């Protein structure tokens, strides 16, 4: 179902302007000039010069040639990243300017290292549904409440690959529209945490293999060090 204006204020849409402007990936505001996304997003990206970050966007259609955007100064890919299935599918975007927090643009708290093993029960996946080369982007930002799936249950489904500790699985929902690099956000003790980053896997429905997310809590050290 459809999201409303101001519901997911940490959610951003990342655009490329080369050759033409189009939605490239999802991402989350994690600080004044820090966007957390997936490293696989940048397979075709040469330099940050071609990127635009749009905050406070409900509809892709509302993006015009007068719409305020954040320029990207640096693309930080995790140095151990090779492909999504081998993990380390995480990246930071250092913006050119600082994000001045409003009700339409605010940051999402990273997960607590004390809540490493906590089984979150209020998780959401949001995006414009861009995960494949041929898929058509959703105009309005979509949301779906997704249950977490244990790494053991996840490994059983993906016998061909290795489901590491640095991965978190979500699915077996009672079709999802997360974007590559998009957030898997869980509300714990009435506070939103960025638990996952959409990486690989099939989908969220009961009839699908679960989505494999970058387990944000395992990268808290990496994120703080890079944003220091």
């Amino acid at each position, epitope marked *: 179902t459809a999201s409303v204006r101001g519901e997911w204020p940490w959610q951003v849409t990342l655009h490329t302007t080369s050759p033409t402007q189009r939605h490239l990936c999802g991402g989350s505001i994690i600080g004044n000039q820090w966007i957390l996304t*997936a490293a696989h997003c940048f397979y075709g990206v040469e330099s940050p010069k071609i990127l635009r970050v749009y905050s406070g966007i409900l509809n892709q259609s509302e993006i015009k040639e007068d719409t305020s955007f954040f320029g990207v100064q640096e693309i930080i890919i995790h140095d151990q990243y090779k492909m*999504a*299935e081998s993990g380390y599918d995480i990246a930071l975007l250092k913006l050119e300017t600082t994000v001045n927090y409003t009700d339409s643009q605010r940051p999402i708290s990273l997960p607590s290292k004390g809540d490493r093993n906590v089984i979150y029960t209020d998780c959401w996946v949001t995006g414009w549904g861009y995960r494949k080369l041929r898929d058509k982007i959703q105009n309005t930002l979509q949301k779906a409440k997704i249950p977490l799936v244990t790494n053991e249950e996840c490994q059983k489904r993906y016998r061909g690959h290795k489901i590491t500790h640095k991965m978190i699985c979500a699915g077996y929902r009672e079709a999802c529209k997360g974007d*590559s690099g998009g957030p898997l956000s869980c509300k714990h003790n009435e506070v939103w945490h960025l638990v996952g980053i959409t990486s690989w896997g099939e989908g969220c429905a009961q009839r699908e293999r679960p989505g494999v997310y970058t387990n944000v809590v395992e990268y808290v050290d990496w994120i703080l060090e890079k944003t220091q």
Partner: antibody
Amino acid sequence: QVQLLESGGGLVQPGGSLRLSCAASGFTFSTAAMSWVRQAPGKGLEWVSGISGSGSSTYYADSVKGRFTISRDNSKNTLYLQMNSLRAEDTAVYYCARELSYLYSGYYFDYWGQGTLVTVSS
Amino acid sequence: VLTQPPSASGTPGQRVTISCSGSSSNIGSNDVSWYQQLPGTAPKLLIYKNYNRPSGVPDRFSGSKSGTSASLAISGLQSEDEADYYCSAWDQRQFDVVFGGGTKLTVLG
């Protein structure tokens, strides 16, 4: 292990119709995006159509839009290509293949069938 | 539209490079794959995501990419390697997966 067995290929008159099939084994069919890729005699490869795991989304090359229809039966582990108003330039071996097309993977075909030759001749 | 030389050649135990020319819309900004097609058989995935080998593809095959071009290197050339080799990439501008016309590799000696 993984098998993709094709059948339904043969000779057809110009303007004729044919239903190609591809039976799968050794992987959970419903989880896979499936495609048809053809190869005209002594030529290279050309993607024809693709279909998602559920069957919700279907895609077609420009040369076959409104003539070919792709479908699947997940209970039967089978993929279909209903081809209508066949033309001489549709003469090729048609292979079914499991495709990967995520932004994370790139666009590739990891498992291929053996192919069925489709001949469109008067 | 990916362009490959129609033919390539080498003697046993040599290295042969099969080349693939493209553009900014395909190779220039997309993951490259390579297929081997032995006479009268279906294609087989040799390389995916530029340099990765699927399970069972020997170390002898290596993929690389530099700008709008991609290369398949076949080291320790065997007579069994005599096949058609195809490069492939998604093309954002055409909005379709594209293939090279293939290179027919001949083993001499």
